[PDB]
Amino acid sequence: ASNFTQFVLVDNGGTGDVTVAPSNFANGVAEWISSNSRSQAYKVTCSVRQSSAQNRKYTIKVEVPKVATQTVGGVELPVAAWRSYLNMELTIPIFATNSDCELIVKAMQGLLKDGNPIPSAIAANSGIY
Amino acid sequence: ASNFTQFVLVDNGGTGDVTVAPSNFANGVAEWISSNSRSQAYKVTCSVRQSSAQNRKYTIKVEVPKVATQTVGGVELPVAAWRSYLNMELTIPIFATNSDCELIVKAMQGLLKDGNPIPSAIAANSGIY
Amino acid sequence: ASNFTQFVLVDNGGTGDVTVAPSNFANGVAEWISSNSRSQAYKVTCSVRQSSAQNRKYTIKVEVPKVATQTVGGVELPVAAWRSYLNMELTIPIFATNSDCELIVKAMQGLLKDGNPIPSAIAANSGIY
Amino acid sequence: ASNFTQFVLVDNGGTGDVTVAPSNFANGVAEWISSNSRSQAYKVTCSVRQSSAQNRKYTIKVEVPKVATQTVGGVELPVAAWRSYLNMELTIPIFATNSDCELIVKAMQGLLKDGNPIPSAIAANSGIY
Amino acid sequence: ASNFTQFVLVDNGGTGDVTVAPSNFANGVAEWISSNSRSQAYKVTCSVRQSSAQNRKYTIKVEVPKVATQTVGGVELPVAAWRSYLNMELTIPIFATNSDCELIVKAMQGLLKDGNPIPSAIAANSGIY
Amino acid sequence: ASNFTQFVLVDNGGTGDVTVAPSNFANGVAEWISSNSRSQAYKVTCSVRQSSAQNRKYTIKVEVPKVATQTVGGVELPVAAWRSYLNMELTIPIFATNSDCELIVKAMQGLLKDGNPIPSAIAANSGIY
RNA sequence: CAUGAGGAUUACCCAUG
RNA sequence: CAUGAGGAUUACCCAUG
RNA sequence: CAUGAGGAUUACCCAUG
RNA sequence: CAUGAGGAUUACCCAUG
C-alpha cells in the first residue's frame, strides 16, 4: 500500500475530468497538481501534525483556477485569471478510534452532497436562508 | 429556494442516520444540530461575507462527537477529548459565475470521495505515505 | 419549521387577547411586538449565547405597558403611562440532554401556574408569608 | 391568604411529579426545595422589595438538576455541569393595581405556554430561527 | 416566519425577471444579492435603528449594474461597466401606529407609480419641466 | 408638455385619495403640496444636478403628516402632531440610455411592491428577521 | 504552540493570548 | 467574560472579581 | 448622534452644528 | 463638491476626506 496516489478531483463524468497526481512531499507537505503548466494547475496539499499533547491536526488546501491566455509585452502566456481557495483544518483527539474517524469522514461527505443546503448555496452564489 | 432545512449529515444506509436540523440564525450565522445534548451533538454552522473588494468568503464549521465508549446524555470531560472540529474557509473571487461555483463544489466532493487519499488517511488515523 | 412565529402573550380567552409577532432579528436578538405604535407596544426579546466553555445562557425580556393618551404641547399622542419589566436569564450546562431541558421548561410553567404561591403574591401586590 | 405553602413545580401527570416545599425564611427570602440532597434538589427562592421610589422588584430564582445519567444521592462534580440556574427579576411601578398585576402574570404564563417559541427553543437545545 | 427572503426586484414579466436572494445579515444590515457573478449582481441592503428617543430610521440601498465584459491583455472578466446607486432614509416617529405606517408605504408606492412625474422624469433622463 | 403636474400620492381607492399639486419651482427644486392647511399638508420635492463629470443625481423628498388639532389657551390650530420624512438620492451615470433608466425605475417599484420584504417590514413597525 | 463568521496575490500575513 | 434579594426612562448603567 | 438639491469607486468619505 | 446602517424641528445641521 501507499495512499499517496493520483485521484479525480473534479468528476465531469469521464470526459473533461480533472485528475490530480502526486507532485511533491518536501517538508512534510504532500502535494498534488493537475497536468498543466504550474501557472494554470489545480493544486491540493495536505499535512498532519500532532498540534498538542492530545490532538492531531490535518491542514488541507485546494486551489481551483480560472484558466486564461494573457498577452504580456506582446507575447501569449498560459496564466490563471484568478483562483478560488479552500482551506480546511481538522482537529481530531488522539482518543478517536478508527471508527470514530470514519464518522468524521462521513459527516464531511454528507455536508457536501448534491442537494444539501451548503453545496446548494455556494453553487448559486447565495447565502443560507 | 429557501435552503435552510434539515438534512442527513451522516448517511449510514437509512438505519442509524444522523440528521441535523436548523437550530439558530443569530447574526446571519446559520446553525444545525443533531438531537443530542450540546456536548454530544453534531453541529454545523455556515456564513458568507464579502471579505474584501475582490473576494467573498464562506466560513463553515462542523463539530463531530467521539462515539466509541460514549455514555449517552452523560458528562464527559475534558471536552477536548470527546470532540473533533472541522473549520473550512472557501474564498471565491467576485468574478465567479454559478458555473464556476458548481465546479468548485465538485472539486470539494472529489477531494472527499470514498477511496481517495485524504479521506482514506483520515479514516485510518494516518498521514500521507 | 422555524420557531420564530407569532404567539399569544396574554390569553384573555379569545376576546382582547394580546398577540405578539416577529419584528426584528438584528444583532442576534429576536424581537416580538404587538400591533401598536412602538410607544405603546408589548415587547418580547430573546437571545442565546455560549457564555462559557460549558454553559449556554438565554436572556429573555418582556415589557408590559400601561397605555394612555397624553397631551404634549396641546396635541394628543399615544404613549405609555409606565411599563413593567421582566428580565430573566437561564444558564443551562452543555451536558443537558433534550429531556433535561424539557424538565426546566416544565419547572418554569409550574412556577407560574394559577393558584401557586408566586403568581398569587404578585397578583395581590403582596409578599410571601 | 398565607401563601407560603408546598406546591407542584414539575407536573408529570400525577405520577413522577416534583413537589417543592417550604424550607427557609431567613431574611424575608422564602425558599422551597424538593426532597433531595441539596446538590440534586429543585430549589425556588423568592423575595420582594422597593427598589426605588417608583418601583417594587420581585427576585425569583430557580435551580433545576440535570437528571439524565444522574446517580441519586451521589457526589457529582463539577457542580456547574449538573445544574441549571434561572434568575428572574420583575420590576413593577408603584402605580400598578391588582388588575394590572394580574395581567402581568398572564403575560408570563403566555410567554412560557407549551408550543410557543421560547419554551420550544429551550426544550430543543435551540435558539431562534 | 421570516421576511428575510428571496423576492423579485425587477419584474420583466415572467422571464428576464431579476430575483434577489438573502446573503448576509451581519451587524443589523440585511443584504440581498442576485445570482451569478457577484461583480455583475444587483444588491439591496436594509437596516433599522432608533436614531433618537422619538424616531426610528430605515436606511435602504439598491445598486443596479450595467452588465459588461472587460477585456484586458486578452483576459476577459465579467464586470459592471458602471452602477446606479439608490440611497433612501425613512424616519418614522415611535407614535406611528400600524395604520400610519401603511399610509407611509402607500405614499412611497404612489410617488413611483408609472405615469407619475418623478418616475417619468427618471425613466427619460429628464428633470422636472 | 409638462411633468410638473398634479398627481395622486396616496391611492386609497377613489375616495380618501391624497392628491399633491405644484406650488413652487425656485432654484431647481420642484415642490408639490396637498390642499388645505399648509401646516397639515403632504409635501414632495425633487431636483436633479450634475454631481460630477460622470454622474447626475436626483434628490427626492416626501413628508407624510399625522393630522391633529392643537389646543393652547383655548385657541385651536390645525397642525401636524408629527411628520415622517423620506429622503432619497439616486445617482445615474451619464452613460445610461433610456432603456437603462427604465430598468432603474422598475427596480425601485419592485423594491416597494406589496408583499415584498421591505414594504412589509415598514408597514408593520418592523425590521428584517 | 492557541483563538479570530481576521486578510491574502494561499504552506503566507495580522491581531489577541 | 463572572457575581450582586445592585439601579434604570430596559439589549443599558453601577460595584466587586 | 444631528443637517447638507454635499461627493463617491456606495454600510464609505466631507463641511457645518 | 465627495463618504457616513451620522442627527433633525427636513432643501438644514455634524464628522471625516
Q: Under DSSP, is residue F119 helix (H, G, I), strand (E, B) or coil?
A: helix
**Counting Cβ atoms within 10 Å, is residue A62 exposed (0-12), middle (13-18) or buried (19+)?**
buried
For cell 462515539, the residue is: B67
Measured on CA atoms in the order B73, B78, B84, B87, is the torsion positive or negative?
positive
- Contact list, A43 vs chain B (CB under 8 Å): none
Short-list B31, B88, B105, CA closest to A125:
B105
Contacts of F121 (CB under 8 A, 6+ apart): E3, E46, E48, E58, F127, F128
The whole-angstrom distance between D7's CA and the closest CA on chain C is 7
Q: How many CB atoms lie within 10 A of CB B13?
A: 6
Distance from CA(F81) to C1'(J9), angstroms, rounded: 12
Torsion angles phi and psi, residue F119, rounded to 5: -65, -30
For cell 444636478, the residue is: F49
Which grid coordinates are listed for F21? Answer: 399639486
Bridge partners of residue C110, in order along the sequence: none
- Contact list, E58 vs chain C (CB under 8 Å): none
Neighbours of chain B (3+ CB pairs under 8 A): A, C, D, E
Distance between start and end Cα atoms, chain E:
46
The whole-angstrom separation of Cα F65 and Cα A22 is 72
The whole-angstrom distance between C90's CA and the closest CA on chain E is 25
The whole-angstrom separation of Cα F122 and Cα F111 is 12
**Nucleotides on strand J with an atom closer than 7 A to protein CB?**
1-11
- Amino acid B53 reads A
Q: Are C115 and D1 in contact (CB under 8 A)?
A: no
- Contact list, B84 vs chain A (CB under 8 Å): 90-93, 96, 100, 104
The whole-angstrom separation of Cα A88 and Cα A77 is 31
Contacts of F78 (CB under 8 A, 6+ apart): F36, F37, F39, F40, F67, F69, F70
Resolution for this model in angstroms, one decimal place?
2.2
Please, how many CA atoms are within 13 Å of residue F96, restricted to the half-sphere of its CB? Answer: 30
Q: What is the side-by-side strand order in the sheet with F29-34? A: E7-10, E18-26, E29-34, E43-50, E55-72, E75-93, F75-93, F55-72, F43-50, F29-34, F18-26, F7-10
Distance from CA(E92) to C1'(I2), angstroms, rounded: 16
What DSSP designation does D7 have? E
In chain C, the residue whose alpha carbon lies closest to the alpha carbon of E93 is C38
Query: How long, in residues, is chain B?
Result: 129
The full DSSP string for D9-34 is EE-SSSSS-EEEEEEE-GGG-EEEE-
Interface residue of E118, E120, E126 to substitute, partner F, most F CBs within 10 Å: E118
For cell 427562592, the residue is: D45
Q: Are C125 and D98 in contact (CB under 8 A)?
A: yes
Which grid coordinates are listed for D22? Answer: 417550604
Q: Under DSSP, is residue E112 helix (H, G, I), strand (E, B) or coil?
A: helix
Name the strand (E) or helix (H) holding F31.
Answer: strand F29-34
Experimental technique used to determine this entry:
X-ray
Which grid coordinates are listed for C85? Answer: 419589566
Torsion angles phi and psi, residue A128, rounded to 5: -100, 130
The whole-angstrom distance between F52's CA and the closest CA on chain C is 36
Q: Are E64 and E70 in contact (CB under 8 A)?
A: no
CB contact under 8 A, C78 and E97: yes
The whole-angstrom separation of Cα D23 and Cα F44 is 70
Q: Are B87 and B63 in contact (CB under 8 A)?
A: no
The full DSSP string for C17-45 is -EEEEEEE-GGG-EEEE-SS-TTT--EEE
Query: Out of 3.30.380.10, 1.10.1740.10, 1.20.120.420, 1.10.510.10, which CATH number does the structure's domain C1-129 have?
Result: 3.30.380.10
